[PDB]
Design a protein around this ligand. Structure first.
Ligand SMILES: [Mg+2]
Ligand SMILES: [Zn+2]
Ligand SMILES: [Zn+2]
Ligand SMILES: [Zn+2]
Ligand SMILES: [Zn+2]
Lengths: 107, 112, 168, 56, 141, 60, 87, 101, 559, 171, 95, 147
């Protein structure tokens, strides 16, 4: 986890994607002065293990691309720190059943 | 939160007068407009430039240009779409089309 | 798809057609080798199928002497099926005219030999459907066979097949 | 424009709201699987009142 | 060969068949028999109600000017670039003489019938050694 | 074309009766009658005077 | 590939025959009864094929089975006897 | 199983609120017989009330949003142009207001 | 007619696949070798010259020909012909794509500018939907107007390893008019080399260099080699469509008035022969450029006339010639007006009025309309007598038939039919008969906006021509009787009748799905009357109540 | 030459034949539209194999018509007319420019150019006999003909042949 | 009469797909053709007096099907080919 | 050739119809004949059937009036140029549309005779009755004032 006061020169961020499998993540304090998830329009987000994701695919008979998507550059995606090919279960407070489940793919 | 705010906005507009429509229709509109990871206006280009059937996509007034793109990219159209099945004249898998009607020799035997 | 010309002649130097090639798969998923047939073997199995389906109809309404056999299976054929099979009459006339063995047991012994030899199926089926006793003359007839088989092995199989089969 | 954009959405026998390509729009339909008609504006009888009135 | 089709009722055959047209149904019926012959007729009057090539000849006439959905400079470019094939055909002379006799007939305030008849008269001969020039005035007059 | 004119307005039943006698099946001793080529100018009169009679129970 | 179908058990689709196949099977049975196919229950002077089909459904003798397509391509089957007709 | 349980939360909560035992005994005075009757009717109706599979929800929704947009009217933007903007974004403002609590 | 039964296996269309034509494909499938710009009236009568208009393609009418495949007119689908161009020409549907790809590849080497060694374009190649990959490649290869043989050093530690073919330089292409110019700055003089080669790139050299591209380069650029090739993307040999696409309208006063597309094709072939004679004879190299420009211009015009507004290219008269894009554009150009919606048959259209003596599922239809419309029935044992009687009626009184259809594709018209009492009407036939009562039928009001306004009805035939419907159903149709007009739609078979009656009928659509309250109701007069009747201060006596009770139809007979 | 393979057929059934006993009815229909038939892919279709345990088991009602579609899988015997090898056929009819040999089911013809020029053909024969030593065209007429090529078309099978080889025409 | 887009749409909303197809064929075009089973084109010459179905260019006499189509769609394919563009494959090849 | 079934009997020797006669829906009124030449006009590609290719003008397919005031006079340049006129009576029916001077457009529902039309004490039986609900929402006071 790396936090910068202000701008990063590209020379100091060209080699961020070096040394796999170690991953480096960047953040502004301005982007971190307020917790995003505590906003009431943002529902609960949780992470899926690869096993239960595979279970989900086998149950709903999808193939891996028919899920609704979510950007890598999304704020909640960056908050969770997930990467490509991961599934986020979303619990939001519906109005016709109260509690409702949904999933997204980080592609 | 984007789609929640959007649903709030559309409900506000359509409920300023002439309320109300049921919730589920509005929710479906919001969801099909937001199910790409990002906002997608229903324009001549917005939802139209998806990986969707060339025939329905040329049913929406960018016709010869999008057919040229389809011919150049040489892609295949799956014909699971209503418009495709209409312009090809087959019964779409819709409502009454959503299944098949299969004979049963076994029950035919059993009911002399 | 690419209009896929694939010009191909049918001969006996393993020059076999695609549409009837060797290794297919049957509908249950098991591998389906090509079934090529001998003339005398076909002469047997048409009779086998005819007696089997005739006894099948005998159960249905319940619940090798060629001069008699051709006309008898003919009247069995117009018992149920139509009289349009004049060409099929020509076919079993051809079978009884040029099939190398009239009797079943010589054919069965030849196939019992060939199941141990493991020869090429279409090659030996063409040989069996042919009715000759001269290997070198057969090689002059078909230069494909002339190029493929040695004459010594061809005659060493041909004589031990020729002594068994009913000469004409 | 709107009706052109929302044509092929279908409820399927798996109770999912899919497009032509099978992309999932709603997982359970409408978050309830309940129809368009058989719905009335009947009232919840637990929200209101006092705590004391409720337990009474 | 001649590729030709004559209608004939295959159950009456008594003549070149006395049939009729049911235009409001687009069908033809053997009137003696009553069996339909062919269906889905094609229109024969609304096509005229919707809205001279023979005088102008086999080559196809073109009145080309300027349009509306283009710039005036591009219309001038169109007028300059549209004059690249005025010498291959003899039709250039045909409509040249047609324009000349149009000027002469409508200067003589003549009927359109007279104009077309003069067009026909020029078109009929239009090229011969019997013509042999004569300053075009002799032949046009 | 087959749109009826005013000939059928009052000319009695051509190849037809003047009235039908059909028994009801919902109450004891009830008959429906179908007059035709007539209207209010006879029906109201018959109903009113028949109702004026006392032995009947229903007339409409 | 892998038979693209299902055993009759663990069929995870509702047992309530719904309106679209209601209409479809009524129409089909109407058409066979129209084209002089064998009827499968007695008649009482009614001549309308559609009503004939309606009664024939009402006492549950339809010689048809139905095939529902899951979105992948795998399919269940059901016998029109084993459904329930309530709507 | 989890989805089915979480899909009927509101309805079962309402059902529990109605058929609380103090309420049914005090207000309604059921019998055993009529109690069984009302249970069976609720079950039967609710199962008749589920979405029939295989019908065009999208077209239904589109028409149900489209037609009351026809009978709708025309500081702050509203009405037809606001609906066009928010349905056609078009990241233009004309009222970029934001409420602050 | 029986439509001339064929033993080909009837199957349905499940997949459709696009692409382009290779010139050998079009030359193989073509039948004719159209060469004469004149079309019709060779001497000058009929049986037209062997140029356009069926030597061996689609016939005109009443002649069997269709290149001797004999389907009269109404079964021959037309048969393609083709012509040969002197020079290759472009495609207005691919002009910008040609510009982008000629930017993309190096000419004279015919290979990609960037080759799996910049990691950025490596991952650009990795990412693919189908064409965002192509656009990424294009925007990464805008630069470096010199082609190279050995760029990569940092793929290795520092080793400079050669992959490239030519060290040549690329221009900067300026799109202009209907052609392409280059500008090779090239920066390799003794000085700065400020000499851009303003050279118009030949279609021939673009075709050759496109022929010199790799298959895997096609896949990178998003071309399918079996269906889509950049050298197929240049026009060389041009198909023509048969006259069923472009029919002579046969002007129906005395003349033909023969049509627009064929005029344009005659223009094309004229310019073609002009160019080739000018080439074959003395070519002074200053008519060649404009002659080929005119040829390319005219084929571009025939393809599209909706281009950037430098030409307009109109014919006689001042109406501009419509091209295929104009034929296929929105608002009734062949897609929104002939496929997605169309004219139909079996329909009617009158005006409407109220009636409080029809219940909701009923509709009143004039006898004239029910005499015009019809509906077939198949002859069963059950309906044999009734259909026999109804045929015996004839087509003039109302409950009668119009056509009889035998088992083969026969239609004996009952109108002429002097043996009308002599048809014994055998089984398995179709009798096509008038609308009887309570047949299901569909009902419409323009403009339809929501799920209602297509609802079904039973039919009660009424006199005095106009439609007739119950007052309660008025507001779903949204139709006062100020002079509005409806539409009728008669179904034609058992399936469609059944599903129409079981879905689109009114009484199972009382509750509006759009707003979960019923859309019906009772309205003005009966509403006022029902409040008037339901008041504590009013009363009824015996005779009135008897008549009202008899007016209730299901009244059980107890007072 | 004759072949054995599992083969598939698709068959329509009219709704009038929806009686209680249709399985053997379909078996009968399979019999008279498999036996005695010709195609291009498989040639002359001779007869069926595996009469028992046949594979139909299920059928779909066509949408627009009450016809029910069925898919039938079956073993059978057909004929495959090859090209380029010898058959000892029989000749029934003849022409002026060659004889027409009926090698079993089809009628293969040999053109007057496809016969060897040194064959001593005499036109004054009934049938016109293209004989040199022994191959006189008779009712039997066992002639060793080699199929140059059985040209495949729509389901009407035709072949061409010649006797320009040693022991070709000669048995 | 007219059967426009909106009428099509609300018929979709009902779901009477067979009625919709019936209205799009029988009330209108209903044309028959033959397509090449290999080209996927409509060039098939069909001598119906002789059951001959040669497809020149493809050069086969076997893989032929007849389909049913709106005539306007047939037309649209004709000028789409005239634009130098549409293979019409009779079954699945993706699964 | 291919002339219609209009039953040309109503015409006369000069190819016109006479004024004052009645015409049904399908009666022709004008007779025309093709003067071409060159078509091999009575010697080729047709039998005799002399030179017609008939261009006759039938009446409109529905209405049925009476021919009134037919004139012929040459056109601008001199031809034979014909105008006819037909006259029809149009009794009101159900569907016809009437309106006030206040935007109360509407049509006839059905009709009644007097003996079941409502009637006032002096016996003034009304011509027509419109519903009261067209008054308040249309707000058409001046209609009432006019009455
Ligand atoms: Mg698609
Ligand atoms: Zn006849
Ligand atoms: Zn043809
Ligand atoms: Zn290069
Ligand atoms: Zn082909």
């Amino acid at each position: 986890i790396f936090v910068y006061q202000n701008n990063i020169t590209p020379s100091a961020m060209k080699l961020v994607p070096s040394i796999p499998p170690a991953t480096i993540e960047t953040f502004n304090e301005a982007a971190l002065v307020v917790n995003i998830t505590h906003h009431e329009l943002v529902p609960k987000h949780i992470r899926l293990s690869s096993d239960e994701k595979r279970e989900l695919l086998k149950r709903y008979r999808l193939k891996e691309s028919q899920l609704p998507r979510i950007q890598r550059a999304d704020p909640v995606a960056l908050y969770l720190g997930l990467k490509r090919g991961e599934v986020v279960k979303i619990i939001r407070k519906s109005e016709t059943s109260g509690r409702y489940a949904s999933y997204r793919i980080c592609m | 939160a984007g789609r929640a705010a959007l649903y709030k906005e559309v409900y506000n507009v359509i409920a300023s007068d002439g309320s109300y429509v049921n919730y589920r229709h509005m929710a479906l509109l919001v969801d099909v407009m937001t199910t790409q990871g990002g906002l997608t206006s229903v324009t001549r280009h917005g939802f139209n430039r998806s990986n969707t059937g060339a025939l329905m996509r040329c049913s929406f007034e960018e016709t010869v240009e999008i057919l040229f793109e389809a011919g150049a990219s040489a892609e295949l159209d799956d014909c699971r779409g209503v418009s495709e099945n209409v312009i090809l004249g087959q019964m779409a898998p819709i409502g009454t089309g959503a299944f098949d009607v299969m004979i049963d020799e076994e029950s035919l035997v059993k009911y002399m | 798809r690419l209009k896929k010309v694939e010009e191909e002649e049918n001969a006996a130097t393993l020059q076999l057609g695609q549409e009837f090639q060797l290794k297919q798969i049957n509908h249950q998923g098991e591998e389906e080798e090509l079934i090529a047939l001998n003339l005398s073997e076909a002469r047997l199995v048409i009779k086998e199928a005819l007696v089997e389906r005739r006894r099948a109809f005998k159960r249905s309404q319940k619940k090798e002497t060629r001069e008699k056999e051709l006309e008898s299976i003919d009247v069995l054929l117009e018992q149920t099926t139509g009289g349009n099979n004049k060409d099929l009459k020509n076919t079993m006339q051809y079978l009884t005219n040029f099939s190398r063995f009239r009797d079943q047991e010589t054919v069965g012994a030849v196939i019992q030999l060939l199941k141990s030899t493991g020869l090429h199926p279409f090659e030996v089926a063409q040989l069996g459907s042919l009715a000759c006793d001269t290997a070198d003359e057969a090689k002059t007839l078909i230069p494909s066979l002339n190029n493929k088989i040695s004459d010594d092995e061809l005659e060493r199989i041909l004589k031990e097949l020729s002594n068994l089969e009913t000469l004409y | 424009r709107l009706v052109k954009a929302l044509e092929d959405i279908m409820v399927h026998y798996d109770n999912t709201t899919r497009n032509s390509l099978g992309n999932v729009i709603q997982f359970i339909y409408g978050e309830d699987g309940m129809d368009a008609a058989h719905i009335e504006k009947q009232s919840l009888d637990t929200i209101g009142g006092s705590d004391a009135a409720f337990e009474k | 060969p001649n590729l030709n089709i004559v209608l004939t009722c295959p159950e009456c055959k008594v003549y070149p068949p006395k049939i009729v047209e049911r235009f409001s149904e687009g069908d033809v019926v053997c009137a003696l028999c009553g069996l339909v012959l062919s269906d889905k007729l094609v229109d024969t009057r609304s096509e005229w109600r919707t809205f001279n090539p023979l005088l102008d000849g086999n080559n196809l006439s073109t009145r080309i000017g300027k349009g509306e959905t283009t710039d005036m400079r591009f219309t001038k470019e169109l007028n300059k670039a549209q004059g690249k094939n005025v010498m291959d055909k003899k039709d250039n002379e045909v409509q040249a003489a047609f324009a000349k006799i149009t000027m002469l007939c409508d200067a003589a305030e003549l009927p359109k019938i007279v104009k077309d008849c003069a067009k026909e008269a020029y078109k009929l001969c239009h090229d011969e050694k019997t013509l042999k020039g004569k300053s075009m005035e002799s032949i046009m007059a | 074309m087959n749109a009826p004119d005013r000939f059928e307005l009052f000319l009695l039943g051509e190849g037809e009766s003047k009235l039908k006698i059909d028994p009801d099946t919902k109450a004891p001793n009830a008959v429906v009658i179908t007059f035709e080529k007539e209207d209010h100018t006879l029906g109201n009169l018959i109903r009113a005077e028949l109702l004026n009679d006392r032995k009947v129970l229903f007339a409409a | 590939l892998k038979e693209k179908a299902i055993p009759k058990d663990q069929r995870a689709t509702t047992p309530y025959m719904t309106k679209y196949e209601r209409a479809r099977i009524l129409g089909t049975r109407a058409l066979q009864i129209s084209m002089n196919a064998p009827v499968f229950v007695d008649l009482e002077g009614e001549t309308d094929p559609l009503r004939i089909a309606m009664k024939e459904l009402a006492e549950k003798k339809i010689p048809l089975v139905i095939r529902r397509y899951l979105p992948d391509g795998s399919f269940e089957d059901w016998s029109v006897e084993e459904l329930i007709v309530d709507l | 199983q989890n989805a089915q349980r979480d899909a009927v939360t509101l309805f079962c909560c309402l059902l529990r609120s109605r058929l609380a035992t103090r309420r049914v005994l005090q207000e309604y005075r059921l019998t055993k017989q009529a109690f069984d009757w009302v249970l069976s009717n609720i079950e039967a109706q609710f199962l008749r009330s589920v979405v029939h599979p295989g019908e065009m929800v999208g077209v239904l929704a589109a028409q149900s949003i489209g037609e009351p947009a026809t009978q709708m009217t025309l500081k702050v933007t509203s009405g037809v142009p606001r609906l066009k903007e928010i349905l056609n974004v078009a990241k233009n403002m004309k009222t970029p207001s934001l409420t602050v609590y | 007619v029986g439509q001339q039964y064929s033993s080909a296996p009837l199957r349905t269309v499940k997949e459709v696949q696009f692409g382009l034509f290779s010139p050998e494909e079009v030359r193989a499938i073509s039948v004719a070798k159209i060469r004469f710009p004149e079309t019709m009236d060779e001497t000058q009568t009929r049986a037209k010259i062997g140029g356009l208009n069926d030597p061996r393609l689609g016939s005109i009418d009443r002649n069997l020909k269709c290149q001797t495949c004999q389907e009269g007119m109404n079964e021959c689908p037309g048969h393609f012909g083709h012509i040969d161009l002197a020079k290759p020409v472009f495609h207005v549907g691919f002009i910008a794509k040609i510009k982008k790809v000629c930017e993309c590849v190096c000419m004279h080497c015919g290979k990609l500018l960037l080759d799996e060694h910049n990691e950025l374009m490596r991952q650009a190649l990795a990412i693919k939907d189908s064409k965002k990959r192509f656009a990424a490649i294009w925007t990464l290869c805008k630069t470096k107007m010199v082609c190279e043989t050995d760029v990569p050093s940092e793929d290795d530690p520092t080793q400079l390893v050669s992959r490239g073919g030519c060290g040549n330089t690329q221009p900067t292409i300026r799109k202009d008019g209907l052609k392409l110019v280059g500008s090779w700055k090239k920066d390799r003089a003794t000085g700065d080399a400020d000499e851009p080669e303003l050279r118009v790139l030949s279609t021939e050299e673009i075709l050759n260099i496109f022929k010199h591209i790799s298959v895997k380069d096609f896949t990178s650029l998003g071309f399918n080699e079996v269906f889509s090739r950049p050298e197929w993307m240049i026009l060389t040999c041009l198909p023509v469509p048969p006259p069923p696409v472009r029919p002579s309208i046969s002007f129906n006063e005395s003349q033909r008035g023969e049509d627009d597309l064929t005029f344009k094709l005659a223009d094309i072939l004229k310019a073609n022969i002009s160019l080739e004679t000018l080439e074959h004879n003395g070519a002074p190299h200053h008519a060649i450029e404009e002659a080929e420009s005119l040829l390319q211009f005219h084929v571009a015009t025939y393809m599209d006339n909706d281009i950037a507004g430098q030409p307009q290219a109109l014919q006689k008269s001042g109406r501009p010639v419509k091209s295929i894009r104009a034929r296929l554009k929105g608002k009734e150009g062949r897609i929104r007006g002939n496929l997605m919606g169309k004219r139909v048959d079996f329909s009617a259209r009158t005006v409407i009025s109220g009636d409080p003596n029809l219940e909701l599922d009923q509709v009143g239809v004039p006898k004239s309309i029910a005499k015009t419309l019809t509906y077939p029935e198949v002859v069963t044992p059950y309906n044999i007598d009734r259909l026999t009687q109804l045929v015996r009626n004839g087509p003039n009184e109302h409950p009668g038939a119009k056509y009889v259809i035998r088992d083969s594709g026969d239609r004996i018209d009952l109108r002429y039919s002097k043996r009308a009492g002599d048809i014994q009407l055998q089984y398995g036939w179709k009798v096509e008969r008038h609308i009887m009562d309570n047949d299901p039928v569909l009902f419409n009001r323009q403009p339809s906006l929501h799920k209602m306004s297509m609802m079904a009805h039973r039919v009660k035939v009424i006199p005095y021509s106009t439609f007739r419907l119950n007052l309660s159903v008025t507001s779903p149709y949204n139709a006062d009787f100020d002079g509005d007009e409806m539409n009728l739609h008669v179904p034609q078979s058992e399936e469609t009748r059944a599903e129409l009656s079981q879905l689109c009928a009114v009484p199972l659509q009382i509750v509006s799905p759009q707003s979960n309250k019923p859309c019906m109701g009772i309205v003005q007069d009966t509403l006022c009357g029902i409040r008037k009747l339901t008041l504590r201060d009013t009363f009824i006596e015996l005779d009135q109540v008897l008549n009202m009770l008899y007016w209730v139809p299901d009244w059980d007979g107890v007072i | 030459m004759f072949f054995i393979k599992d083969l598939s057929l698709n068959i329509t059934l009219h709704p009038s034949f929806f009686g209680p006993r249709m399985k053997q009815y379909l078996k009968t229909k399979l019999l008279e539209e498999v036996e005695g038939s010709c195609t291009g892919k498989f040639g002359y279709i001779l007869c069926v194999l595996d009469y028992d345990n046949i594979d139909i088991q299920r059928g779909r009602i066509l949408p627009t018509d009450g016809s029910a579609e069925f898919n039938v899988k079956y073993r059978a015997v057909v004929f495959k007319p090859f090209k380029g090898e010898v058959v000892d056929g029989t000749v029934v009819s003849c022409s002026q420019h060659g004889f027409e040999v009926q090698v079993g089911p089809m009628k293969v013809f040999v053109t007057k150019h496809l016969m060897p020029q040194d064959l001593t053909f005499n036109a004054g024969s009934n049938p016109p006999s293209y004989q040199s030593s022994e191959d006189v065209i008779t009712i039997k007429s066992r002639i060793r003909v080699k199929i140059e090529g059985c040209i495949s078309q729509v389901s009407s099978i035709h072949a061409i042949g010649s006797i320009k080889e040693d022991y070709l025409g000669a048995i | 009469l007219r059967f426009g887009e909106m009428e099509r749409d609300c018929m979709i909303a009902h779901g009477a797909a067979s009625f919709l197809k019936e209205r799009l064929m029988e009330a209108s075009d209903a044309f028959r053709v033959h397509i090449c089973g290999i080209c996927g084109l409509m060039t098939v010459i069909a001598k119906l007096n002789h059951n001959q179905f040669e497809c020149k260019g493809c050069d086969n006499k076997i893989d032929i099907y007849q389909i049913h189509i709106p005539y306007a769609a047939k037309l649209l394919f004709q000028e789409l080919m005239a634009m130098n563009i549409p293979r019409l494959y009779t079954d699945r090849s993706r699964d | 050739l291919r002339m219609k079934h209009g039953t040309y009997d109503k015409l006369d020797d000069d190819g016109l119809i006479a004024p004052g006669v009645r015409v049904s829906g399908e009666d022709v009124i004008i007779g025309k004949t093709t003067p071409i030449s060159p078509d091999e006009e009575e010697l080729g590609q047709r039998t005799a059937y002399h030179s017609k290719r008939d261009a006759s003008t039938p009446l409109r397919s529905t209405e049925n009036g009476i021919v009134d005031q037919v004139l012929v006079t040459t056109n601008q340049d001199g031809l034979k140029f014909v105008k006819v006129r037909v006259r029809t009576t149009k009794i009101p029916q159900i569907g016809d549309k009437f309106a006030s001077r206040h935007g109360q457009k509407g049509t006839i529902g059905i009709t009644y005779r007097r003996e079941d039309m409502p009637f006032t004490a002096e016996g003034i039986v009304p011509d027509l009755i419109i519903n009261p609900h067209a008054i308040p929402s249309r707000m058409t006071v001046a209609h009432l004032i006019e009455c």
